[PDB]
Amino acid sequence: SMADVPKELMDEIHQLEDMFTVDSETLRKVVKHFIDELNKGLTKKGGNIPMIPGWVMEFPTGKESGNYLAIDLGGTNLRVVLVKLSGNHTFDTTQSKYKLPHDMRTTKHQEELWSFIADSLKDFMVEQELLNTDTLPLGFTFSYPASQNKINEGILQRWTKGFDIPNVEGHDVVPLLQNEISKRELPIEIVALINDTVGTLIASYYTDPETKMGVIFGTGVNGAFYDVVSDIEKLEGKLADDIPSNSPMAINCEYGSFDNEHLVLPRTKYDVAVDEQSPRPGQQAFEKMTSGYYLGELLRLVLLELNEKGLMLKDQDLSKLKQPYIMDTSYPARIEDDPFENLEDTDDIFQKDFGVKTTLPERKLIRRLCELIGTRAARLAVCGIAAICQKRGYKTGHIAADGSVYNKYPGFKEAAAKGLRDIYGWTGDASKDPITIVPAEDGSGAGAAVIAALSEKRIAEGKSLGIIGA
């Protein structure tokens, strides 16, 4: 409880509560502007929300069959996956995991990244003995901003989620990987570049036709959904006749860039601080305050400012806490996950990891802080779901969700659901909820394979997969 915390700290906890609490009226405010930005991003003039086409113009039926490869570039490790779509409305996947070398996510020699992915593919080929012969369709899940005018293209906009490699931005990633595959004479062809949220949208629809959206609450945030071609104004008169107006089209929103103008989001001085000190300030406004990548950075700055104010961690060595992005989301997650009255797990963390001693009330505050920024992250993140469900007329449906924060972060699922009930105003038992958030399918694995299948079928039918002349 709080029945033994000094008045100095209780007054700070009350202010932190007031700034990190987002009521239902504010959520509804954010959502309305969110909807405008979604529409604006579909016009030629554009907007801060990219609204990138995914070039998937069909719903998976289940009758899809074949052997498709699918790689997934995460920040921690590369994931090669073989997917046998049986057509029984399920799949059989043989996968591998290849750890990323130390400085890889940050390497100055970009050729090492592609060289790594290609070599890892060859190992998977020899271990699965599938190095005889058709050309294996490959689905490449590249979950970073990348505009695409056709499905087998991905021009890197900017690195996120801890990635920083020199000469890849503004470049098509696909040929980089493709002509590395061909140097090793591997029987692979990149048939599709897919965003993790889109692969998720499709993998889940494949096994749940009630899937209205595929969202990621992970080290990054993003959401994909099926729109209709006619709604996408910017593609007006840039498409072939095999892509009609009533046609479905998976949209990769890339809405982590929402409100870069800063006109609705309840940013605080700590939020502004995180932004100003981040690699590229003025970017990812929405993402910076809901994303797993930044949640710990928030905690770090609040702790630092409360210290440089003679209120907390007095006469302690904050030498280790001074390093930016030293705290990832595991810290808030583990602090909130502390089962002990005296918060003994938390104590151990600041001692072993940062070499700083805390009193009991100091951990009482740290803990309540992790609750506030985590609950706000949830309540704000679901504003993208309500916005999409309302721009389209989705009265009911399932939202396929994945991500390390959705999955691992304590009480996040509950918070995201309550945040969603507050926005709509729903009252009673949660089973009555017309729209619910459900655990997603394998988006980067199964999903990408299901998209390679849908893509090869169009190639075979001679039909297009991008804008004319792309």
Ligand X SMILES: OC[C@H]1O[C@@H](O)[C@H](O)[C@@H](O)[C@@H]1O
Residue numbers in the known binding site for substrate are 143, 160-161, 195-196, 222, 254, 287
Nearest residue (CB) to ligand X, 66 versus 443: 443
Q: Which residues are annotated as a binding site for ATP?
A: 72-77, 97, 292-293, 329-333, 404-408
Q: What CA–CA distance (Å, rounded) separates 37 from 383? A: 12
* Of residues 222-251, those binding ligand X (CB under 6 A): 222
Q: Site for ligand X (CB under 6 A): which residue of 137, 218, 332, 419? A: 218
User: What region does 185 belong to: left with phi over 0, alpha with psi -120 to 50, or beta?
Assistant: left
Token pair in block for residue 243:
């892509």
Does 220 participate in binding ligand X (rule CB under 6 A)?
Answer: yes
Residues catalogued as catalytic? 143, 158, 196
Sheet holding 397-402, edge to edge: 52-53, 248-252, 221-228, 211-217, 397-402, 435-439
Q: Which stretch binds ligand X (CB under 6 A): 60-68, 141-149, 332-340, 385-393?
A: 141-149
Q: What CA–CA distance (Å, rounded) separates 451 from 322? A: 44
Q: What CA–CA distance (Å, rounded) separates 191 from 199? A: 14
Does 260 participate in binding ligand X (rule CB under 6 A)?
Answer: no
Does 161 participate in binding ligand X (rule CB under 6 A)?
Answer: yes
Nearest residue (CB) to ligand X, 144 versus 258: 144
Measured from the Cβ of residue 44, the count of other Cβ atoms closer than 10 Å reads 8
Q: What CA–CA distance (Å, rounded) separates 464 from 369? A: 51
Q: Which stretch binds ligand X (CB under 6 A): 143-151, 182-190, 263-271, 320-328?
A: 143-151
Nearest residue (CB) to ligand X, 217 versus 354: 217
**Secondary structure E strands in 58-171:** 66-73, 77-85, 91-99, 136-141, 146-147, 155-156
249-283: buried (b, 16+ CB within 10 Å) or exposed (e) per residue? Answer: bbbbbbbbbbbbeeebbbbbebbebbbeebeeeeb
Answer for the pair 443, 204: CB distance below 8 angstroms, yes or no.
Answer: yes
Does 392 participate in binding ligand X (rule CB under 6 A)?
Answer: no
Q: Site for ligand X (CB under 6 A): which residue of 120, 160, 329, 455? A: 160
Does 47 participate in binding ligand X (rule CB under 6 A)?
Answer: no
What is the nearest approach in angstroms of ligand X to the Cβ of residue 212? 17
User: What region does 315 belong to: left with phi over 0, alpha with psi -120 to 50, or beta?
Assistant: left
Nearest residue (CB) to ligand X, 72 versus 456: 72
Interface map 179-208 toward ligand X (x if CB under 6 A): ----------------xxx-----------
Instruction: Give the number of residues in contact with ligand X, rule: CB under 6 A.
Output: 14
Name the residues that contact ligand X, by CB under 6 A: 143-145, 160-161, 195-197, 216, 218, 220, 222, 254, 256
